[PDB]
Design an enzyme around this catalytic site. Sequence first.
Site, PDB file in Angstrom:
ATOM      1  N   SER B 140      56.766 -24.722 149.615  1.00 44.00           N
ATOM      2  CA  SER B 140      57.625 -23.923 148.702  1.00 44.00           C
ATOM      3  C   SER B 140      58.556 -23.014 149.498  1.00 44.00           C
ATOM      4  O   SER B 140      58.183 -22.538 150.570  1.00 44.00           O
ATOM      5  CB  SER B 140      56.781 -23.103 147.703  1.00 44.00           C
ATOM      6  N   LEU B 252      64.742 -45.542 154.725  1.00 39.62           N
ATOM      7  CA  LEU B 252      65.158 -44.144 154.611  1.00 39.62           C
ATOM      8  C   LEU B 252      66.140 -43.688 155.683  1.00 39.62           C
ATOM      9  O   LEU B 252      67.106 -43.016 155.334  1.00 39.62           O
ATOM     10  CB  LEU B 252      63.959 -43.174 154.510  1.00 39.62           C
ATOM     11  N   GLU B 254      68.468 -45.324 157.115  1.00 36.82           N
ATOM     12  CA  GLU B 254      69.828 -45.837 156.797  1.00 36.82           C
ATOM     13  C   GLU B 254      70.485 -45.035 155.717  1.00 36.82           C
ATOM     14  O   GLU B 254      71.710 -44.782 155.750  1.00 36.82           O
ATOM     15  CB  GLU B 254      69.838 -47.287 156.349  1.00 36.82           C
TER      16      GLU B 254
HETATM   17  N1  LIG Z   1      55.972 -27.412 141.857  1.00 39.04           N
HETATM   18  C1  LIG Z   1      54.921 -26.641 142.242  1.00 39.04           C
HETATM   19  N2  LIG Z   1      55.164 -25.382 142.592  1.00 39.04           N
HETATM   20  C2  LIG Z   1      54.217 -24.535 142.978  1.00 39.04           C
HETATM   21  C3  LIG Z   1      52.840 -24.974 143.045  1.00 39.04           C
HETATM   22  N3  LIG Z   1      52.107 -23.909 143.438  1.00 39.04           N
HETATM   23  C4  LIG Z   1      52.991 -22.863 143.666  1.00 39.04           C
HETATM   24  N4  LIG Z   1      54.261 -23.258 143.354  1.00 39.04           N
HETATM   25  C5  LIG Z   1      55.502 -22.500 143.470  1.00 39.04           C
HETATM   26  O1  LIG Z   1      55.535 -22.071 144.836  1.00 39.04           O
HETATM   27  C6  LIG Z   1      55.937 -20.674 144.927  1.00 39.04           C
HETATM   28  C7  LIG Z   1      54.749 -19.836 145.241  1.00 39.04           C
HETATM   29  O2  LIG Z   1      54.410 -20.199 146.554  1.00 39.04           O
HETATM   30  P1  LIG Z   1      52.954 -20.759 146.966  1.00 39.04           P
HETATM   31  O3  LIG Z   1      53.079 -22.131 147.575  1.00 39.04           O
HETATM   32  O4  LIG Z   1      51.909 -20.564 145.900  1.00 39.04           O
HETATM   33  O5  LIG Z   1      52.664 -19.691 148.152  1.00 39.04           O
HETATM   34  P2  LIG Z   1      51.928 -19.998 149.529  1.00 39.04           P
HETATM   35  O6  LIG Z   1      52.786 -20.953 150.325  1.00 39.04           O
HETATM   36  O7  LIG Z   1      50.508 -20.380 149.344  1.00 39.04           O
HETATM   37  O8  LIG Z   1      52.069 -18.542 150.192  1.00 39.04           O
HETATM   38  P3  LIG Z   1      51.065 -17.278 150.057  1.00 39.04           P
HETATM   39  O9  LIG Z   1      50.192 -17.461 148.825  1.00 39.04           O
HETATM   40  O10 LIG Z   1      52.147 -16.197 149.976  1.00 39.04           O
HETATM   41  O11 LIG Z   1      50.322 -17.349 151.374  1.00 39.04           O
HETATM   42  C8  LIG Z   1      56.349 -20.251 143.539  1.00 39.04           C
HETATM   43  O12 LIG Z   1      57.730 -20.651 143.361  1.00 39.04           O
HETATM   44  C9  LIG Z   1      55.479 -21.191 142.709  1.00 39.04           C
HETATM   45  O13 LIG Z   1      56.101 -21.438 141.454  1.00 39.04           O
HETATM   46  C10 LIG Z   1      52.602 -26.368 142.664  1.00 39.04           C
HETATM   47  O14 LIG Z   1      51.447 -26.840 142.653  1.00 39.04           O
HETATM   48  N5  LIG Z   1      53.657 -27.114 142.266  1.00 39.04           N
END
Ligand SMILES: Nc1nc2c(ncn2[C@@H]2O[C@H](COP(=O)(O)OP(=O)(O)OP(=O)(O)O)[C@@H](O)[C@H]2O)c(=O)[nH]1
Lengths: 67, 440, 427
Positions: B140, B252, B254
């Site tokens: 993310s 991919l 290409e």
């Molecule tokens: N699409 C999707 N987005 C997610 C998921 N879990 C968290 N998010 C999104 O990711 C962001 C939150 O980051 P996370 O990945 O939970 O945070 P992390 O990387 O674990 O970081 P910390 O908890 O700060 O250590 C927010 O935008 C959430 O909406 C998931 O399973 N799917």
Amino acid sequence: KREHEREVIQKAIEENNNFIKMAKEKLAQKMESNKENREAHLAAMLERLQEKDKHAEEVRKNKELKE
Amino acid sequence: MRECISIHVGQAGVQIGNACWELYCLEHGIQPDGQMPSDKTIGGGDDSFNTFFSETGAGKHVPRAVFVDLEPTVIDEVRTGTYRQLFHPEQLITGKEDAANNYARGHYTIGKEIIDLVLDRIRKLADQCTGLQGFLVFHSFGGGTGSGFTSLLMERLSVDYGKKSKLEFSIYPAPQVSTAVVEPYNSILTTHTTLEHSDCAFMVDNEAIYDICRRNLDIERPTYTNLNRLISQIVSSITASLRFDGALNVDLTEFQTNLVPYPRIHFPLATYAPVISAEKAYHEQLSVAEITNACFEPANQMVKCDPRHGKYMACCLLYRGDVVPKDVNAAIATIKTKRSIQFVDWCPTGFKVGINYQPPTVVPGGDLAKVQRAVCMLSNTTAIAEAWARLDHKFDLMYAKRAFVHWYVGEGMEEGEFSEAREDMAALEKDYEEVGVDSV
Amino acid sequence: MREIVHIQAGQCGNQIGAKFWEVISDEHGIDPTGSYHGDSDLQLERINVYYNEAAGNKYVPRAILVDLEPGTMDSVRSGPFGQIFRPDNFVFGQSGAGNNWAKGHYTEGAELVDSVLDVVRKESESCDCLQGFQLTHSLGGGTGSGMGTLLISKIREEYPDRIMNTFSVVPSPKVSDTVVEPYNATLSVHQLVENTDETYCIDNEALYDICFRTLKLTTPTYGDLNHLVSATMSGVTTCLRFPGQLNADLRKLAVNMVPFPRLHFFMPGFAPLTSRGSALTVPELTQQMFDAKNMMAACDPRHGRYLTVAAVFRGRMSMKEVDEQMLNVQNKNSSYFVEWIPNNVKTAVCDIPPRGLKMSATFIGNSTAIQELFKRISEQFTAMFRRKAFLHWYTGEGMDEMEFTEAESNMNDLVSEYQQYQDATAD
Ligand SMILES: Nc1nc2c(ncn2[C@@H]2O[C@H](COP(=O)(O)OP(=O)(O)OP(=O)(O)O)[C@@H](O)[C@H]2O)c(=O)[nH]1
Ligand SMILES: CC[C@@H](C)[C@@H](NC(=O)[C@@H]1CCCCN1C)C(=O)N(C)[C@H](C[C@@H](OC(C)=O)c1nc(C(=O)N[C@@H](Cc2ccccc2)C[C@@H](C)C(=O)O)cs1)C(C)C
Ligand SMILES: Nc1nc2c(ncn2[C@@H]2O[C@H](COP(=O)(O)OP(=O)(O)O)[C@@H](O)[C@H]2O)c(=O)[nH]1
Ligand SMILES: [Ca+2]
Ligand SMILES: [Mg+2]
Ligand SMILES: [Mg+2]
């Protein structure tokens, strides 16, 4: 032409090596500079707190200095 | 012969990772214990699926994957879940304390405590490869690990692997599911840090996926599980070229050639079709023309932006299932002549196309209908810049008052890193403007 | 896991402390000698946040109980659940502070402080991954306020990087006749603005008014105020205690809630307001928790702006409905949300409803309106201190006048800092 072919692969290698070197360098300066900043910020927090101890001995001394 | 290693980082990366592996197993006929009855070479082989799975002597097909989180509870579910026999415990790495939504913790404070261990486990995976192609990183933009850990990792992989390509799949934040006010900070910081290190990045806008679930699958309040299933279909369409082979398959790399005209301009827009529930697909084949035209409808994009208001620089189509050239050629010729699509004048107006015969699969108990033929389109449009402008503006609103900045400074950062990151973004936005202007 | 250490101090701290443990133990389904007898596994998933493990599968509150009065200690051991606290975890003094902050902070408090630290260390050191500390105390007495803020300084020295959380009860003339409270409070706030990460402002003025005016209580008791305080504490810690995405630990909450290090004082809110002995909709719930009458600090939110807000809904209700109502609320009230912090209201939905309520709402606001509370404390402090009243009680203990000035004006700086962010625009 054959000397030029050689320069080209040499330049490739050089530019790739230089990309790695610069990244290593920038990474290490950022890490040590982040380490210093974080140390300072914690040193200052603790010494503020130390100054609370000095002041609290100073408040208790002043008490027992009243007869 | 070309192995890809997948790195899943932080909660989003990890959870999307499970959805992707589950789905790959189904696609390749691999059972949750790793066995694959249909594979006649035991212990190795150079089949197409071997770019993503290695093989033990016991016939177990093991993901070429590392999962990393600074906290254990997400990966713990993978350790005890349905697929727990798929991975060697060494591929699942956890720390004890997470980054608290703070890039500075993922990059310096906490991340630096685990980065050599992660590199180390990656090096074990690299060492079992005969012709390592590169890396795919899932993460993310918004979380502290997702952002600051990933970017630290990307820096170190550049140093330890130079050559090696690195592709990202990055979750872009949406207010319907986000969990931190500082997500704009994390996002700008990670983009600035990662830009020089990544070859190609696929943004997945959580709002776009959220809306696709609401509207095309009648899900009222979509959860991560819902979004991840859909996201997993898009990722699978994109890695399908590496995982299968076929006379019409285009690789991919290409597509990459066509999609990246300049190193910084490397963010393709993905569009997927058809996303249709079972009830609605009953008594309905969508033809090649139908699903193709649906790639040019913004409701199907995976980032919210409008390509009708910008210019294309490339357009690639990745077809899967019952699809034949006659029909692709005819469907594209139609779109051409129906002139709905405008390229920058410095770029020929073609369409690179691939086809994999394997049909798409669905996970049991999901919301997606199983269809005959699907298509993923990757384009490079100046419109993707919109997504950066929306984020840059949120950044600007907060940073003018230094809101929340003390959390990053307390972890060692300088305001200088913020303004340097944001200048880099201003420059990226000027770049997408410059490439769109007509030549002299 | 991510453990919190709980500390309760002085009469108030110990009263609200005990109720909190009564409530959350019930919620987590554990008896007065610490045995689990719940029906749902979500009760145990994050039970370590607040409880240690015992032999015989006995759960023990990670709680440390402190007073300069030996009395309240016994009345704690007497209440229900009094038999669950680790008995070494009681730490009591001789005199009592008799509403003198300086005694709490410099002299009698100091002499007891070291023995408190010993229990804190014991607890901490056992902890797998400690998130930090929560302190319940009052700000008007002498122990909770003076010894409590000393304890905080002292813990921050040894755990500079863990989160420090208080539940601070603020004084009202309407509830206590002590003339000296504005002194005890101003000197407390001076310490808290420097040494806590997040502070929940429970205002006795607000709690009195809800009980008299709204709840029809005739002559309201402490037990009556504390009924609200415990509902609130249950609500604001839900996210810490059950599984969920949002504000799931102390640092994440701070990071979401505290845009500037000194502006870390929250007004909590709750709906529905009730007393003991005998369902709202999502839209009523939602409208109520943005209403001045449901605030546990005596501030009108329409007299300031929110910098940040967390909302927590509990009960089995429609998620799409909560989403819509929350959007609705922000649109119709957009003026009261600083425009320069985007997406600054967060929303959590927990299925587990509280006790004898089918659905409820808890609100945590970092609002610039909270300056009202400080300005009131400030008006009282300065009514006296100008006429140097009662000073002798404090100077006698060694305190200079200067310390009063500095604290007065640190709290004025604070007020004017809120005003600055209330006034700021996007250009
Ligand atoms: N699409 C999707 N987005 C997610 C998921 N879990 C968290 N998010 C999104 O990711 C962001 C939150 O980051 P996370 O990945 O939970 O945070 P992390 O990387 O674990 O970081 P910390 O908890 O700060 O250590 C927010 O935008 C959430 O909406 C998931 O399973 N799917
Ligand atoms: C005349 C002096 C007081 C009796 C009274 N009024 C005043 O103090 C004056 C009167 C008008 C001018 C300025 N004000 C401040 C008062 O009502 N007080 C102090 C109460 C507190 C008091 O209430 C009364 C009238 O009995 C107390 N309540 C308890 C109490 O609740 N005890 C519970 C246990 C307990 C709880 C907390 C602390 C001690 C004991 C026991 C049960 C019955 C319960 O749960 O309600 C102890 S003293 C409220 C303002 C909170
Ligand atoms: N809500 C509430 N307020 C209290 C309680 N006990 C005392 N107070 C208020 O607490 C303040 C006095 O502090 P107290 O705890 O009695 O002093 P300490 O024992 O020195 O910490 C006054 O403002 C009281 O009106 C309580 O149980 N509930
Ligand atoms: Ca094989
Ligand atoms: Mg995380
Ligand atoms: Mg007392």
